[PDB]
Design a binder for this molecule. Structure first.
Ligand SMILES: NCCC[C@H](N)C(=O)O
Ligand SMILES: [K+]
Ligand SMILES: [K+]
Ligand SMILES: [K+]
Ligand SMILES: [K+]
Ligand SMILES: [Mg+2]
Ligand SMILES: [Mg+2]
Ligand SMILES: [Mg+2]
Ligand SMILES: [Mg+2]
Ligand SMILES: [Mg+2]
Ligand SMILES: [Mg+2]
Ligand SMILES: [Mg+2]
Ligand SMILES: [Mg+2]
Ligand SMILES: [Mg+2]
Ligand SMILES: [Mg+2]
Ligand SMILES: [Mg+2]
Ligand SMILES: [Mg+2]
Ligand SMILES: [Mg+2]
Ligand SMILES: [Mg+2]
Ligand SMILES: [Mg+2]
Ligand SMILES: [Mg+2]
Ligand SMILES: [Mg+2]
Ligand SMILES: [Mg+2]
Ligand SMILES: [Mg+2]
Ligand SMILES: [Mg+2]
Ligand SMILES: [Mg+2]
Ligand SMILES: [Mg+2]
Ligand SMILES: [Mg+2]
Ligand SMILES: [Mg+2]
Ligand SMILES: [Mg+2]
Lengths: 117, 103, 48, 110, 142, 34
RNA sequence: CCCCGGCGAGGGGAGUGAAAAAGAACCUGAAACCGUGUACGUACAAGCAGUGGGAGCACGCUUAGGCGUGUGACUGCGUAC
RNA sequence: ACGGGGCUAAACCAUGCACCGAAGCUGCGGCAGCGACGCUUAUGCGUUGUUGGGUAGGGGAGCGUUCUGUAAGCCUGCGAA
């Protein structure tokens, strides 16, 4: 019962090199380098599914801060005023209204200014 | 005219006719959903800000599809320590089509 | 009752240990022997 | 109509012939014959006999006219290498590669 | 829904003019770095230059506090061995006064090809005169 | 001795080539970590 | 058998054959490696070369839009096994 | 011999209220392990509690390859490997 390895080992190597397309040099041609690069690309992707949630909230807060300062208030007082006024809109939607509907954002600032005063 | 409602632990800004992808709902395909927890309704500089909810505000939508999302590959690797393991994942969703924002 | 319908009783055909066949098997790279010394060597180990 | 001539197992390396084949790529064949005449390379003698044989192939086997033809494709491929043994100092033996080439000239009036 | 991204072909940039007479150096430079980056706009994107053009007049009349007019020292190296060179604040004002504000703002901008393109919108002049009247700069009382 | 070399069948003792202490220009002042 | 070539090597036709990219360097004809063509990127730009975000361009779709494929300016993080 | 720019506070001390901040906690969806109780099982389902970083190493369950039987069967020149 002698088993030759030609068909199975070729299909295993071809599966890795298909995932290594677009990589530079031996990282897309050579199996020893490509396998090593596909594992690192999976570690980065696992890490950046956590980092993607951090970077978007960083982008929403920076946009809320800029549009709130156009109305005479900082970020930290605008968030405190919306919590006191029982408004439960999250930072994704607030930064989206701050770009696309600017007078509806003005209505939220005046709501937050009333709850602080 | 848009509105803001919460569903599936997340919030969405939708309008009439728009197709929105949510988390999985236990509703059959073709059945109507109602969202009574509406957070804000804006219609041409008349803004109803809910405190937390615009009461009297309901969003109606029609379930059009279920399905699983694109496969995500999960890779864990610890160098020089003889450890790796791998895992796949597909996430369920529900597509709804917004039919009425009634303030 | 055919030649492709017969089965062994459940629990009578445990599969054997195959050492040194990758990470996922739990027995790769040392075959359960640990790192160096007399007991990890081929033909190694002290007498009775 | 496209017309091919080839020189297979031509005795020279592909890097040396490719210097001469990049001179005449895209040219009219009357202009390309003059470039090869005044190029002082051994590979320019090789490429000229394949270009001359492609011109004769196209007027005899295809009925084309010589004033219309252009070199649309030209490329050199690597052939089999011959393995020789070169003695070095102190008993060392090196391997010599004697590289060959496949010259392909393509002419067409279109 | 994906979050809005500003597109660099349809971004609106505007022109401002700032008078640096009697301003504190660093406190003026922090506001110039916000507006060259575009931190004051709601369309702010971290990989797009959404900032403004700013003209700075009277760079030789900027102010520092303490003893920093004689004690703040600017260093550079030339690449030749033993080639460390220094200059005090008073000598940078006397010799090339526009560099004082340009060096201060450059340290507050991001580092990379986008931060070098944000620096190109700063126009610093040692006197009261600029020749950018065709761009109609707005007076920014900052 | 290397008796069945196929790349170099003409030579059996080749350590005068690559081993540094067996070359003709080896000097014992290279071995000064004593 | 005809043509180019040195009465060469090598090739192009013609013909045989189910097939000649089965032509004697001959079944199938993988990979490293080396080329030709096309799309996009690249000559003010610093590092394990990916990953997360993302403009523009090209080709397909199908529409009263924004999807698919290729490329990836710019930007966050990131020192192989 | 602040990470840099810069800073006379953007330093230090005391008090106070906001906000940022992790794979911690919460929300929504999904999978699995071990207990307990059950529409009743025939050993699977339902409810609920809890758990799921991991080297050496121990335990459990699988994929695929060649060969023998089932197979003088089944697929295949209307195209097998
Ligand atoms: N006795 C002499 C044998 C020589 C041989 N070719 C060698 O290299 O040893
Ligand atoms: K053991
Ligand atoms: K064949
Ligand atoms: K090949
Ligand atoms: K990057
Ligand atoms: Mg074993
Ligand atoms: Mg183990
Ligand atoms: Mg031991
Ligand atoms: Mg060992
Ligand atoms: Mg030890
Ligand atoms: Mg032994
Ligand atoms: Mg022993
Ligand atoms: Mg010699
Ligand atoms: Mg000799
Ligand atoms: Mg001999
Ligand atoms: Mg046939
Ligand atoms: Mg034929
Ligand atoms: Mg046959
Ligand atoms: Mg063959
Ligand atoms: Mg081939
Ligand atoms: Mg450039
Ligand atoms: Mg420069
Ligand atoms: Mg610091
Ligand atoms: Mg907070
Ligand atoms: Mg978090
Ligand atoms: Mg967390
Ligand atoms: Mg947790
Ligand atoms: Mg575990
Ligand atoms: Mg069989
Ligand atoms: Mg088979």
């Amino acid at each position: 019962a002698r088993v030759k390895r030609g068909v199975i080992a070729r299909a295993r190597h071809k599966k890795i090199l298909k995932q290594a397309k677009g990589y530079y040099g031996a990282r897309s041609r050579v199996y020893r380098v490509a396998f090593q690069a596909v594992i690192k690309a999976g570690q980065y992707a696992y890490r950046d599914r956590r980092q993607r949630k951090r970077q978007f909230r960083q982008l929403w807060i920076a946009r809320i801060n800029a549009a709130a300062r156009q109305n005479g208030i900082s970020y930290s007082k605008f968030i405190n005023g919306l919590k006191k006024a029982s408004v439960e809109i999250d930072r994704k939607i607030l930064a989206d209204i701050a770009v696309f509907d600017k007078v509806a954002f003005t209505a939220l600032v005046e709501k937050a200014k009333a709850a602080l005063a | 005219m848009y509105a803001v409602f919460q569903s599936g632990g997340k919030q969405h800004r939708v309008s009439e006719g728009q197709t929105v992808r949510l988390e999985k709902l236990d509703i059959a395909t073709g059945e109507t959903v109602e969202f009574a927890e509406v957070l804000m309704i804006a219609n041409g500089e008349e803004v109803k800000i809910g405190v937390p909810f615009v009461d009297g505000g309901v969003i109606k939508a029609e379930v059009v599809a279920h399905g699983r999302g694109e496969k995500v590959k999960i890779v864990k690797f610890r160098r020089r320590k003889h450890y790796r393991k791998q895992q796949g994942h597909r996430q369920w969703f529900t597509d709804v089509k917004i039919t009425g924002i009634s303030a | 009752m055919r030649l492709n319908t017969l089965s062994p009783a459940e629990g009578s055909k445990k599969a054997g240990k195959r050492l040194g066949r990758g990470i996922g098997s739990g027995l790769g790279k040392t075959g359960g022997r640990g790192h160096k010394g007399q007991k990890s060597r081929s033909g190694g180990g002290v007498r009775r | 109509m496209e017309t091919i001539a080839k020189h297979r197992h031509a005795r020279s390396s592909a890097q040396k012939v490719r210097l001469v084949a990049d001179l005449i790529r895209g040219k009219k064949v009357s202009q390309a014959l003059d470039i090869l005449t005044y190029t002082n390379k051994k590979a320019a003698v090789l490429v000229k006999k394949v270009l001359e044989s492609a011109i004769a192939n196209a007027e005899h086997n295809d009925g084309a006219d010589i004033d219309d033809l252009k070199v649309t494709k030209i490329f050199v491929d690597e052939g089999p290498s011959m393995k020789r043994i070169m003695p070095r100092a102190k008993g060392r033996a090196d391997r010599i590669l004697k590289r060959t080439s496949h010259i392909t000239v393509v002419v067409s009036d279109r | 829904m994906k979050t809005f991204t500003a597109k660099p072909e349809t971004v609106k940039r505007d022109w401002y003019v700032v008078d640096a007479t009697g301003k504190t150096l660093g406190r003026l430079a922090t506001e110039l770095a916000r507006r060259l980056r575009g931190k004051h706009k709601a369309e702010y994107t971290p990989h797009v230059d959404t900032g403004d053009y700013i003209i700075v007049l009277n760079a030789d009349k900027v102010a520092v506090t303490g003893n920093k007019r004689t004690d703040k020292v600017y260093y550079h190296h030339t690449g030749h061995i033993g080639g460390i060179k220094q200059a005090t604040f008073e000598e940078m004002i006397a010799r090339r006064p526009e560099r004082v504000i340009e060096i201060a703002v450059k340290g507050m901008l991001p580092k990379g090809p986008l931060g070098r393109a944000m620096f190109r919108k700063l126009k610093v002049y040692a006197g009261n005169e600029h020749n950018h009247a065709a761009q109609q700069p707005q007076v920014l009382d900052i | 001795m290397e008796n069945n070399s196929r790349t170099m069948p003409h030579i059996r003792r080749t350590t005068h080539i690559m081993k540094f202490a067996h070359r003709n220009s080896f000097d014992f002042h290279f071995f000064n970590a004593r």
